[PDB]
Design an enzyme around this catalytic site. Structure first.
Site, PDB file in Angstrom:
ATOM      1  N   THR A 156       0.856  -1.215  -0.109  1.00  0.00           N
ATOM      2  CA  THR A 156      -0.130  -0.016   0.186  1.00  0.00           C
ATOM      3  C   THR A 156       1.009   1.292  -0.074  1.00  0.00           C
ATOM      4  OG1 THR A 156      -2.240  -0.591   0.789  1.00  0.00           O
ATOM      5  CG2 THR A 156      -1.402   1.509   1.675  1.00  0.00           C
ATOM      6  N   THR A 157       0.608   2.129  -0.852  1.00  0.00           N
ATOM      7  CA  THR A 157       1.125   3.690  -0.915  1.00  0.00           C
ATOM      8  C   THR A 157       0.093   4.566  -0.974  1.00  0.00           C
ATOM      9  OG1 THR A 157       2.983   2.646  -2.291  1.00  0.00           O
ATOM     10  CG2 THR A 157       2.890   5.005  -1.911  1.00  0.00           C
ATOM     11  N   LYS A 188      -8.650   2.966  -1.967  1.00  0.00           N
ATOM     12  CA  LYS A 188      -8.436   3.114  -0.630  1.00  0.00           C
ATOM     13  C   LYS A 188      -8.760   4.657  -0.214  1.00  0.00           C
ATOM     14  CE  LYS A 188      -4.558  -0.214  -1.169  1.00  0.00           C
ATOM     15  NZ  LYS A 188      -3.060  -0.273  -1.373  1.00  0.00           N
ATOM     16  N   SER A 247       3.451   0.709   3.209  1.00  0.00           N
ATOM     17  CA  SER A 247       4.722  -0.004   3.048  1.00  0.00           C
ATOM     18  C   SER A 247       5.572   0.539   1.945  1.00  0.00           C
ATOM     19  CB  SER A 247       4.419  -1.323   2.623  1.00  0.00           C
ATOM     20  OG  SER A 247       4.072  -1.286   1.130  1.00  0.00           O
ATOM     21  N   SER A 249       4.460  -5.005  -2.325  1.00  0.00           N
ATOM     22  CA  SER A 249       3.024  -4.818  -1.865  1.00  0.00           C
ATOM     23  C   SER A 249       2.223  -3.488  -2.160  1.00  0.00           C
ATOM     24  CB  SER A 249       3.121  -4.468  -0.356  1.00  0.00           C
ATOM     25  OG  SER A 249       3.638  -5.739   0.310  1.00  0.00           O
TER      26      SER A 249
END
Ligand SMILES: [Cl-]
Ligand SMILES: [Cl-]
Ligand SMILES: [Cl-]
Ligand SMILES: [Cl-]
Ligand SMILES: [Cl-]
Ligand SMILES: [Cl-]
Ligand SMILES: [Cl-]
Ligand SMILES: [Cl-]
Ligand SMILES: [K+]
Ligand SMILES: [K+]
Ligand SMILES: [K+]
Lengths: 123, 196, 219, 199, 201, 213, 216, 204, 196, 199
Positions: D1-2, D33, D129, D168
């Protein structure tokens, strides 16, 4: 390690090094053993002690185990090794197996030790 | 769990060992001997791990016998005990150590009656009286109570009697029979086994 | 267990296998993994069998109650949220991974919900032990606004893929088609394997079995 | 996830990626998200998917009620506090970092970081991450007073680089722009994605 | 497993069960737990099956070598001692074997118990296995050196059969041997369950 | 850490008759929840008189079969004859035990003929304990194959059945039936069933399809 | 190797009519991090056999030089004998099991494609010594994703042309890029045939992200 | 294993207008057996039976607590319980202890009151129902029982033949389990009668 | 580790329990009673954890006595045994479980002589004969051997004799004294304690 | 630790930071991690200090002998192989990544990464704890064919950003430039260090 063949065959088919060792025993002290009915008896001679020497040390009759004893002839220095090697084998046979050593087994071990020294390098 | 005991007198050494060969929860033998004859006047009593005890005890036994053959005379109780101590101490910091608790009793022609105590760690100590096993915790106080260095053989067996009776009454394990032997001037004598 | 959901033009289609495994042995060769929630909403259950069953029945019961008080056709979005919050409360201890699909005033919708309480909305998905195989097919051959018939075929193919490729997946493939007009549940839509045949007859003449005791109670 | 949030004069930009992963397998390559707490307030999701979604729902609920009681659109600060409070009350029980960014009349476009149950306001924030690999990028690529479009480039760029580095992180980039006028929601597909050094 | 051996006026008798187990499943019910080293040497198996077979067979090899070298055969005491030393070589390595050595030699009827630990004992009675406790129970009550061969066979059967009844890891058939001055004779191989029903009446 | 073992499934079965021996196995090789290959028979020819069946860790099975193959040549160069069924069984026991402290995760069953021409079956464990028997199953579904054979071949738990000697025809059907039943329940059993028949004429192979799910 | 450092993901393999085709992405991952996005995980053993490898890349490069030397040593003799695809597979099985048994394994999963005597070869080698042959092969996540695709096509059509095998592989690399977090969109395709081994340059699978708009 | 502590084997079969249910008679702790005449099959009414395999305490507890709920059902309702309803009652009872379950896997076997129809099912330790048209097994020798049932069962069996099949399936599966045995008890259920039989099983 | 045993006859129940109260390695008592009087014809013999046994046994004892006072009649051996089973089973999945192994012997005026065996897990089973403790492994086979359901009281004590002698010979723990009592038509009768 | 190596036409640039740390305490804020294997070959040190220094010494020793036997300055490839071989022979026993960069006549300026006992040649490489934070930066800030001075900026910049982000990286920046002419060694002090976004 010293890797030289000491005992080798001769052109006629003789092991000279073994035969010279048999000349050493013929120069050795007289030893006689005789089996009886109830007992067995050894007897050793050619003692020729200078009477200035303690004869307790130079005894040619040695006990290997409780039921086994021996007498020798020849190089008395060599005997001590064989005797002590047989004495160690006496207790090893008592450790590996419960039973005490038979007379034939000790004789077989001493014989196998002497044979090994005729076919091994360096000795 | 086994039991050993030794009582040294002015001219004799009294030793006793239980006759139980136990596996998990069963008594396999009623008449197992835990005493080893080293010399004509030396006895070695061994206790501990199942397979380790006999192998170790016999190894020392055969080496003391080897000394007798190679020299014409036997090892002194002190020299014998120090030999067993050396062999156990050298195996202590090895891959396979022996977990054996032993008691050496002997009679010397010069020094006299001797009794030696030894750990599985191989710590040697000379004692007027000693005991091995869990039963020692119940019997060493009785020994402390009635022991005098001038105890007679008649009183020594009676003192042993008092100790063995305590094991019947208070000790949780069943130890009904005991081997009893005395070492002195004349050597090792087999004495009537104490049964309950 | 292989379960999949597909969204097409006229509605949604859900698929499941029929194999339930206890330990590494097969207990049920014919179990229903497509669950009634509402007349036009169904849910596919993968995970702990008892958990999927009970969670599903709970939702279905609540949904009926909701419909009764509301007086209106239930929303699939409503079903998804109910499930999430219940599942979230238990911190993933209720082992239920579910594919829920239905038709609304708002159209056809496909959701997937996880035992920890996460949800995601998407055109196609697959859950369970054989998900890898099923996702592969959908990823490969999915176009938007597929005709029902193409959708029926692809879903079957996707689930079939799981049956053969996965050890915890087997049996027949069940499909449920949901359209605004109706919801048609087709059990045993396709069966890849049929072995009824046995070569030996292991029958016993009466009396072969030794009996110590006999007692008969007449009724 | 960014996840990324950037602040400009008219309002804010909130960025995200599209992937959720279970270990080495990806379970959703298309996940938004970016969740709205209110009409003008958005939050960016990271951490446990279940935990993040659970907090997002409660925050939206409490703020909805907060708004009605005040009869005014909630302050972003207020929005940020509720999220901080839920995260802090259950720091051991909940694993999530939420970035809350939006617009209000009183203080304009604002960006808040709630990681770990703390409250901080920043010119811009990154989370997830993927953020580790772009710390250098953002420090060198940031200029004060970037225009809405400059801000969009900035968040898109940073996330693109993170996505390529991070296992990720992946999928498409989701972007929202919050201004006094409204909410602009756009998606960047792989083909549209910026290119840099790949090998 | 269940294994027993005892001796009386007419020799030594040996009885074993026939069951092999892996966890809770039964690998075999026909298992032979007696190794016939020689016409007058016998060995029983308990613990790890592979460990018993290999080592007791290796003992058998050494018993054969002994007979060739001296041409006189081997004493029971010596045979058991040999096996003990082999296990002593492999200490702390998790070998698991419980065995008994039966024979007739110059000393007379010989019975020994040998262990994976290296334990070695001589005795009138021994029982080894998961059900040895049950075997001991029936053996101890109803045993006298004053037994007839028929009575001894009854006790052997009886002991094993009852042990198998109570014990999960003991079952199958009773294999009984008789050790006579001349050599061993295989008495019977009877099904345990059938015996138990017979005893039930 | 690191595990030197993997479970690959597979079940092997052997039955002995008057002049025949049967070694049968599934063709499924698997790992975890995935199938490696559907074409992996566990039966293997050693001699014209003996056949081996290996199951468990396939890495061990491959290495062990190659060791036996080499040891068969070593024997025949030294003894001027083929290694007998009983001799191979005695050899396998020693090879398996030489790895007592790092065992082959393997379930071996040997099927062939003795020196009298009669059928012989030898069953092994991973460490090397073995014996001769009429019938034995080994592997992941051995607990499923055994009880049916105990009842039919051994005539156990039956009262007035006349005890008919085992024929090749009946044993072949017995081999097929138990594997069909096992493929229905065991997840590691399926795809195809290969049967190797050892007779005085030699080795004959037969293949019957199974469940592929 | 006790703990692998830089790892490579799934390696593909499927045999067509007159040869075999192998695919592997050019990624070397350090944990989750994509460290090297342009490194070759495929090698050419000789003119008959090729090799693609998963797992630890340092262990692959070690096996690359050992196999490389073995071909060199064999070419020096020039006795008309060369290593067959089966012989390489057999050697590799023995090499991996030997290292495994010493509790010091080479952390690798191998796919070996080859063409000799008019027959196509495809062999699998594990880090524990597990080896077999199959018409289609997929390691790591490919075994869960790409392998189901390959098997379903090969069930309907056992024999494929080189073009059919290529487009099937490209379809599989698309699925792998979508579903594997440890994958990348830069891959190679190796092919054995009557002409020999041919490894093609950096390729990218066509991706579609239109399902990103199907959430409202 | 916790299930392996006491052991046990329960099996049910289906036939022509009839059902059969059987269990082993062993009560034992790990190493030893204690009782030869232990009960595992319990009547939940005329023509409906439950078999319980697993931990002996939970076997007895579930049976007692199910009877508690059954009798209250049969008193509140003016009817005798339907087999499907009992299955759901056991399922609810077991699932209530989801995170602290009874270590027993039950087997329902019986004919439907009024409608004659045969019914057989088995459940999880946490209450997951399994309905089949052939057979259901539960216990420590699940694999052994599955192997027999798959080979022996036939679609339409008369009470005479069903008893022989269900017995032989139980006899031989038990003889391969070390924690199950000491006799097998078989109940054959018909509309007219119920036949109870103890078999000459191995006592080792 | 303690020992219990029960033998049921055609019209009587014979029960015996050891009299050892043991701590770590010592026998604190020679005459400890492990039998509990529940009714005029009910006996409960308990074994297990040191403090848990007496507390549990007396709790059931006082509740069976409470039933007698509240109703004017005593609980049947079956109802009593099922009551003890219920109390132990309810504490099984709790924070503090009772590790008690018990044996209930009773005489009913209708059903007759009864003997009940119970685990610490609370599994109840009716048996013609049963034994608790490690000694059961050595004695259950002797019981299997000589037991007939028509055994006389004279033979029952002699069968008990055979079992207790086995504990002296084979069992590793020291259990010299045993409490012996018979329950029948007339009630509980104290019988001569068997000492060794 | 942050280490960097960049390749240009004339030769190479190798960069390092100055800090070694024991947990949260720094034991040397002035440490040169640039060690020469040969006259024209350098390596950059990361990992266990003891292990890295031990490998550096052996590599320099073997290459010194290698050079004499060939009577020619060692190839950089050769240099890289010895380091790779030592690292691989003892992957479990030694914890180090060494970047080896230098110049030789045959192939010019070259950069090799030996992390984990593998051999790869790159246009540029980064290593150490600090490298994580600059992965994004380097991907966006890299252009082919940068001049020696452009390369120096590049490595200095990247390391500066890493140093500020990383707790295990700090001190001054050590720089060497390897060309056919010779070795240029320079140090950048804190005051000289590039400035970016700090807050
Ligand atoms: Cl719900
Ligand atoms: Cl199925
Ligand atoms: Cl974060
Ligand atoms: Cl047998
Ligand atoms: Cl070998
Ligand atoms: Cl090898
Ligand atoms: Cl880089
Ligand atoms: Cl690094
Ligand atoms: K002796
Ligand atoms: K920041
Ligand atoms: K012999």
């Amino acid at each position: 390690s010293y890797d030289r063949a000491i005992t080798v065959f001769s052109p006629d088919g003789h092991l000279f090094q073994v035969e010279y060792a048999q000349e050493a025993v013929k120069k050795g002290s007289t030893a006689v053993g005789v089996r009886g009915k109830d007992i067995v008896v050894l007897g050793v001679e050619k003692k020729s002690v200078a009477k200035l020497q303690d004869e307790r040390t130079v005894r040619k009759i040695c006990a290997l185990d409780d039921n086994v004893c021996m007498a020798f002839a020849g190089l008395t220095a060599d005997a001590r090794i064989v005797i002590n090697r047989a004495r160690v084998e006496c207790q090893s046979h008592r450790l590996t197996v419960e039973d005490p050593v038979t007379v034939e087994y000790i004789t077989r071990y001493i014989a196998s030790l002497k044979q090994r020294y005729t076919q091994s390098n360096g000795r | 769990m086994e039991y050993l005991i030794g009582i040294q007198g002015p001219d004799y050494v009294l030793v006793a060992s239980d006759r139980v060969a136990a596996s998990n929860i069963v008594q396999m033998k009623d008449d197992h001997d835990k005493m080893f004859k080293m010399s004509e006047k030396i006895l070695l009593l061994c206790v501990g791990e199942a397979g380790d005890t006999v192998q170790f005890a016999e190894y020392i036994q055969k080496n003391v016998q080897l000394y007798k053959m190679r020299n014409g005379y036997e090892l002194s109780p002190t020299a014998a005990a120090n030999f067993t101590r050396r062999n156990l101490a050298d195996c202590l910091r090895s891959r396979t150590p022996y977990h054996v608790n032993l008691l050496l009793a002997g009679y010397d022609e010069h020094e006299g009656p001797a009794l030696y105590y030894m750990d599985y760690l191989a710590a040697l100590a000379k004692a007027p009286f000693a005991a091995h096993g869990y039963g020692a915790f119940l019997t060493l106080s009785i020994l402390d109570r009635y022991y005098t260095p001038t105890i007679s053989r008649e009183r020594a067996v009676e003192l042993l009697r008092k100790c063995l009776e305590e094991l019947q009454k208070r000790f949780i394990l069943n130890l009904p029979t005991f081997s009893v032997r005395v070492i002195d001037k004349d050597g090792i004598h087999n004495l009537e086994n104490i049964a309950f | 267990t292989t379960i999949a959901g597909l969204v097409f033009r006229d509605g949604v289609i859900l698929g499941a296998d029929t194999r339930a495994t206890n330990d590494s042995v097969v207990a049920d060769k014919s179990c229903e993994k497509i669950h009634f929630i509402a007349p036009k909403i169904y849910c596919c259950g993968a995970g702990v069998a008892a958990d999927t069953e009970m969670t599903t029945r709970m939702a279905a019961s609540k949904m009926e109650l909701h419909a009764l008080s509301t007086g209106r056709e239930p929303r699939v979005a409503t079903v998804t949220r109910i499930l999430r919050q219940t599942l979230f409360r238990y911190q993933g201890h209720v082992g239920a991974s579910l594919v829920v699909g239905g038709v609304d005033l708002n159209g056809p919708q496909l959701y997937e919900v996880h035992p920890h309480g996460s949800y995601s909305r998407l055109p196609f998905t697959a859950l369970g032990s054989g998900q890898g195989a099923a996702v592969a097919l959908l990823e490969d051959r999915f176009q938007p606004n597929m005709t029902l018939e193409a959708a029926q075929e692809l879903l079957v193919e996707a689930i079939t893929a799981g049956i053969l490729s996965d050890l915890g997946s087997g049996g027949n493939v069940d499909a449920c088609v949901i359209t605004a007009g109706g919801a048609k549940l087709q059990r045993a839509l396709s069966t890849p394997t049929e072995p009824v045949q046995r070569a030996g007859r292991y029958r016993f003449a009466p009396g072969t079995t030794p009996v110590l005791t006999r007692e008969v109670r007449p009724l | 996830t960014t996840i990324m949030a950037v602040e400009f004069d008219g309002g804010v930009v909130v960025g995200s990626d599209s992937r959720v992963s279970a270990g080495t397998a990806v379970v959703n390559r298309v996940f938004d998200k970016l969740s709205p707490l209110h009409q003008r307030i958005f939050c960016a999701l990271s951490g446990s998917a279940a935990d993040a979604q659970a907090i997002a729902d409660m925050a939206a609920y409490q703020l909805e009620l907060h708004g009605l009681e005040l009869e005014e659109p909630p302050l972003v600060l207020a929005a940020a506090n509720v999220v901080k409070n839920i995260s802090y009350k259950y720091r051991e029980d909940l694993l999530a970092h939420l970035i809350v960014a939006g617009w209000d009349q009183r203080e304009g476009g604002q960006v808040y970081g709630t990681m770990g149950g703390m409250l901080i306001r920043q010119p811009f924030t990154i989370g997830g991450s993927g953020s580790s690999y772009i710390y250098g990028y953002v420090d060198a690529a940031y200029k004060p007073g970037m225009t809405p479009e400059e801000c969009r480039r900035f968040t898109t760029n940073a996330i693109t680089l993170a996505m390529n580095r991070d296992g990720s992180s992946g999928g498409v980039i989701y972007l929202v722009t919050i201004t006094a006028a409204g909410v602009d929601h756009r998606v960047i597909l792989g083909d549209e994605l910026p290119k840099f050094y790949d090998e | 497993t269940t294994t027993l051996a005892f001796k009386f006026q007419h020799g030594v008798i040996v009885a074993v069960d026939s069951r092999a187990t892996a966890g809770s499943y039964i690998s075999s019910l026909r298992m032979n737990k007696v190794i016939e080293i020689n016409p007058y040497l016998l060995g029983t198996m308990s613990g790890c099956a592979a460990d018993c077979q290999y080592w007791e067979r290796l003992l058998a090899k050494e018993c054969r070598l002994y007979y060739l070298r001296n041409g006189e055969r081997i004493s029971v005491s010596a045979a058991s001692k040999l096996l003990s030393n082999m296990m002593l070589q492999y200490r702390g390595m998790g070998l698991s074997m419980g065995s008994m050595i039966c024979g007739w030699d110059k000393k007379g009827p010989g019975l020994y118990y040998v262990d994976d630990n290296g334990t070695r004992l001589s005795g009138q009675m021994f029982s080894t296995g998961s059900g040895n406790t049950y075997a001991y129970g029936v053996m101890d009550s109803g045993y006298r050196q004053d037994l007839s061969p028929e009575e001894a066979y009854d006790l052997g059967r009886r002991a094993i059969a009852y042990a198998t009844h109570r014990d999960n890891y003991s079952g199958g058939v009773v294999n009984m041997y008789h050790m006579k001055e001349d050599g061993w004779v295989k008495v019977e191989s009877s099904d345990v369950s059938d015996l138990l029903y017979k005893y039930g009446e | 850490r690191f595990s030197p073992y993997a479970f690959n499934g597979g079940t092997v079965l052997a039955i002995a008759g008057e002049d025949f021996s049967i070694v049968a196995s599934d063709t499924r090789l698997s790992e975890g929840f995935s199938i490696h290959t559907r074409d992996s028979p566990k039966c293997y020819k050693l001699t014209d008189k003996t056949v081996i069946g290996c199951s468990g860790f396939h890495g061990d099975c491959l290495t062990l079969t190659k060791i036996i193959e080499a040891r068969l040549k070593m024997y025949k160069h030294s003894n001027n004859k083929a290694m007998t069924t009983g001799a191979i069984a005695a050899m396998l026991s020693t090879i398996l035990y030489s790895r007592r402290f790092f065992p082959y995760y393997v379930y071996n069953i040997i099927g062939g003929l003795d020196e009298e021409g009669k059928g012989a079956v030898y069953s092994f464990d991973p460490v090397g304990s073995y014996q001769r028997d009429s019938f034995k199953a080994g592997g992941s579904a051995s607990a499923m194959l055994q009880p049916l054979l105990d009842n039919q071949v051994g005539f156990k738990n039956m009262q007035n059945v006349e005890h008919v000697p085992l024929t090749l025809d009946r044993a072949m059907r017995l081999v097929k039936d138990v594997f069909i039943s096992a493929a229905e329940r065991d997840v590691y059993t399926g795809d195809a069933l290969r049967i190797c028949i050892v007779t005085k004429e030699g080795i004959r192979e037969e293949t019957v399809p199974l469940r592929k799910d | 190797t006790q703990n692998p450092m830089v790892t490579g993901t799934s390696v593909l393999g499927v045999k067509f009519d007159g040869g075999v085709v192998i695919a592997a992405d050019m990624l070397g991952s350090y944990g989750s991090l994509a460290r090297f996005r342009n490194i070759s995980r495929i090698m050419r053993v000789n003119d008959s056999t090729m090799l693609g490898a998963s797992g630890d890349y340092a262990d692959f490069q070690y096996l690359k030089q050992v196999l490389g030397q073995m071909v060199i040593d064999e070419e020096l003799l020039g006795d008309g004998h060369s290593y067959s695809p089966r012989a390489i597979h057999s050697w590799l099985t023995r090499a991996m099991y030997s290292r495994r048994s010493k509790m010091n394994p080479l952390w690798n999963t191998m796919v070996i494609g080859g063409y000799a005597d008019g027959e196509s070869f495809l062999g699998y080698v594990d880090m524990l010594g597990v080896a077999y042959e199959a018409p289609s092969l997929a390691t790591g996540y490919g075994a869960y994703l790409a392998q189901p695709l390959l098997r379903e096509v090969l069930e309907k059509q056992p024999v494929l042309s080189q073009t059919e095998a290529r487009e099937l592989v490209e379809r599989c690399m698309r699925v792998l890029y979508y579903r594997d977090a440890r994958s990348y969109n830069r891959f190679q395709i190796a092919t054995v045939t009557e002409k020999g081994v041919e490894i093609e340059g950096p390729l990218s699978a066509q991706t579609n992200w239109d399902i990103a708009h199907m959430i409202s | 294993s916790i299930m392996s502590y006491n052991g046990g084997a329960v099996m049910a079969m289906k036939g022509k207008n009839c059902v059969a249910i059987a269990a082993d008679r062993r009560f034992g702790i790990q190493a030893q057996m204690v009782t030869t005449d232990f009960q595992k099959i319990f009547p939940m009414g005329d023509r409906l039976y439950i078999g319980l395999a697993g931990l002996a305490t939970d076997v007895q507890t579930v049976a007692q607590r199910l009877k508690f709920r059954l009798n209250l059902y049969e008193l509140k309702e003016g009817r005798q319980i339907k087999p499907y309803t009992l299955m759901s009652m056991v399922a609810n009872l077991l699932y209530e202890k989801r995170f602290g379950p009874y270590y027993t896997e039950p087997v329902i076997a019986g004919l439907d009151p009024k409608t004659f129809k045969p019914f057989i099912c088995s459940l999880d330790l946490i209450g997951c129902p399994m309905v089949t048209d052939d057979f259901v097994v539960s216990g420590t020798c699940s694999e052994q029982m599955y192997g027999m049932c798959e080979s022996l069962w036939e679609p339409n069996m008369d009470p005479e033949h069903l008893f022989e099949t269900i017995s032989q399936a139980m006899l031989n599966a038990v003889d391969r389990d070390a924690v199950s045995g000491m006799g097998v008890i078989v109940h054959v259920i018909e509309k007219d009668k119920i036949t109870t039989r103890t078999l000459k099983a191995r006592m080792d």
